[PDB]
């Protein structure tokens, strides 16, 4: 401006109507995604810090980014001589890629979920084909980690399959990371070779990466001491291969977001996003929903919605037009990725809005009335796009959605948000 102290709010009204639009959807909608969080305004005030202004690679900063370091390994009770942490990575990807290019040589043998398979009996990961096929496939890295399970996943027992055909073991914890720091479920970093998260899901900050892994002695024979290598790898894949200078703005805000989840108000949080998934669960289960896995022990839930007789497609888009969002998902023994049969919900976006138990039981409510609705709407009509152009253009339809909406959105207002006031 003038002086460039000028507020949003007078320097550019147009922006700030964009913003506080922005901010009333989020407020009247009931927010599903399991992958989705309202971040706290601390982490926000410094992600708009001067650190904006500070330029650095390879005074104030390098001791925010060694506090960063420091409060990472703290956040997830780590011994600083076992474990080391790169808090520079800029989101998950980077911090996923930093590892494959680390530890892997070019076509060196890989598994992951999709591979390795779950059993469609339990809904649980095959560990028995894992092993076999590993002892097979010989890869030289396995990751452990999905975005749709509502399980507890056994790290030990892959730590067996990887002992054996000599693989890095890499726990991919994003979904779970606030779940894991908070101790309420198992902790991966027992078992894992290298450990990555992103830190805007269950921690609740900005969308940045972190990468743990293993230093110090990794075994003695019985040169002596024999250490771990994986650090001078990570760090040279992240700066300078990958990547440029940190935002150092964003790594205050990681460090922010790490102090708050060492918190007991953290854990009490993660506590009631556990309570929060079961009620989901057990009102889906008492309406006659099938679960994938019979129910839950973390963060989400996964809906099959075959037995219905509706798909995850269809599901998803009369949700959103009633101001609830959630995500399809692929079931095991599903055709198509374009119709698959699951819908995934989860606890922590409106756990963070002090939703309770019995605030979920009438989210399913909401949920129940909406996949009525696209049962009735599946039976008059073909196409998936027949389906999704009814919801707009069949007056009876529209109306039924309008009033839904309304009873979702005056329900939801009603919770308070993480963030700023207005923007």
């Known amino acids: 401006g003038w002086t460039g102290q000028e507020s949003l709010s007078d320097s ?42 500070k330029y650095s690679e390879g005074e104030v900063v390098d001791e925010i980014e060694l506090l960063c370091q420091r409060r990472a390994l703290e956040a997830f009770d780590l011994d600083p001589a076992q474990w080391g942490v790169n808090v520079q990575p ?27 398979k779950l059993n469609p009996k339990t809904g649980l990961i095959d560990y028995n084909q894992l092993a076999l096929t590993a002892r097979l496939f010989r890869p030289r890295l396995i990751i452990a980690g999905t975005s749709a399970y509502a399980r507890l996943i056994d790290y030990a027992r892959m730590r067996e399959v990887c002992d054996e055909v000599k693989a890095h073991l890499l726990a991919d914890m994003a979904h779970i990371s606030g779940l894991v720091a908070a101790k309420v479920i198992p902790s991966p970093f027992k078992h894992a070779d290298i450990v990555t998260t992103t830190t805007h ?43 440029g200078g940190p935002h150092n703005h964003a790594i205050a805000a990681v460090a922010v977001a790490l102090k708050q989840a060492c918190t007991p108000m953290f854990r009490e949080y993660s506590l009631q996003v556990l309570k929060n998934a079961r009620a989901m669960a057990d009102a889906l289960l008492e309406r006659g ?62 756990t963070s809005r002090q939703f309770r138990e019995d605030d979920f039981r009438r989210v399913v409510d909401f949920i129940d009335e909406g996949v009525n609705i696209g049962l009735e709407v599946k039976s008059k009509t073909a196409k998936l796009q027949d389906f999704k152009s009814f919801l707009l253009k069949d007056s009876e339809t529209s109306q039924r959605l309008a009033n839904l909406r309304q009873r979702v959105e005056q329900f939801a207002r009603a919770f308070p948000m993480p963030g700023f006031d207005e923007h």
């Open 12 to 53: 550019d009204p147009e922006m700030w109507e964009l913003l506080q639009r922005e901010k009333d959807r989020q407020c009247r909608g009931l927010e599903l995604i399991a992958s989705e969080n309202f971040c706290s305004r601390a982490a926000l005030e410094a992600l708009g810090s001067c650190l904006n202004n």
């Open 90 to 116: 800029y989101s998950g990807s980077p911090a996923n890629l930093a590892v494959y290019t680390a530890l892997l040589q070019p076509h060196d043998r890989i598994m992951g979920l999709d591979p390795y």
């Open 201 to 243: 899901k269950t921690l609740r900050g900005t969308r940045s990466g972190l990468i743990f892994y293993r230093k110090g002695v990794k075994a003695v024979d019985p040169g002596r001491e024999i250490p771990y290598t994986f650090e001078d790898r990570i760090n040279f894949a992240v700066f300078p291969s990958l990547q």
């Open 289 to 350: 929903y099938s679960l994938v896995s019979g129910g839950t022990d973390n963060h989400l839930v996964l809906v099959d919605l075959r037995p219905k007789g509706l798909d995850g497609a269809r599901a998803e888009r009369v949700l959103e037009l009633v101001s609830i969002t959630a995500n399809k998902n692929t079931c095991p023994g599903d055709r198509s990725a374009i119709t698959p049969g699951g819908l995934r919900l989860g606890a922590p976006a409106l």
